Amino acid sequence: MKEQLKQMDKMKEDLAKTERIKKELEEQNVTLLEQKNDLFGSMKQLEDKVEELLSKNYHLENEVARLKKLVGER
Amino acid sequence: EEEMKEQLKQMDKMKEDLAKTERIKKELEEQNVTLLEQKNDLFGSMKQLEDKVEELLSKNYHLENEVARLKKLVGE
Hints:
The PDB classes it as contractile protein. The structure is a homodimer. Chain A has a single domain, classed as Single alpha-helices involved in coiled-coils or other helix-helix interfaces. Chain A has one helix and no strands. Chain A has one helix at residues 2-71.
């Protein structure tokens, strides 16, 4: 019966360790989900930015081309 | 001294509380490694998006200088 109290003593520290690590992982898990979400939010902003710049790029190409003719270039 | 059955059992419930917690722990490590991979892939896409943003900003800049040059050329 004495060894059990001991076997239990060790077991208590193992459970305590495993539990604390389980809690760290839960927190980590929560941080990752919120980080993936942040990246989705950032990509949506960049995609719209790319859209906007693309329109500006196409508009600018049309201006240059028109002005190229007007001045007799290339 | 017949109190042993109490802790001898308390011992058994602890043996399972430990196996359970370890099983959940390993599951979480697993899921977290997955989320980590998914987080990196997303991060990569974003970077590429950023690469595209810079390139466009750069082409547009050159293009705006052309308009400027050409306009000046017309006025001379």
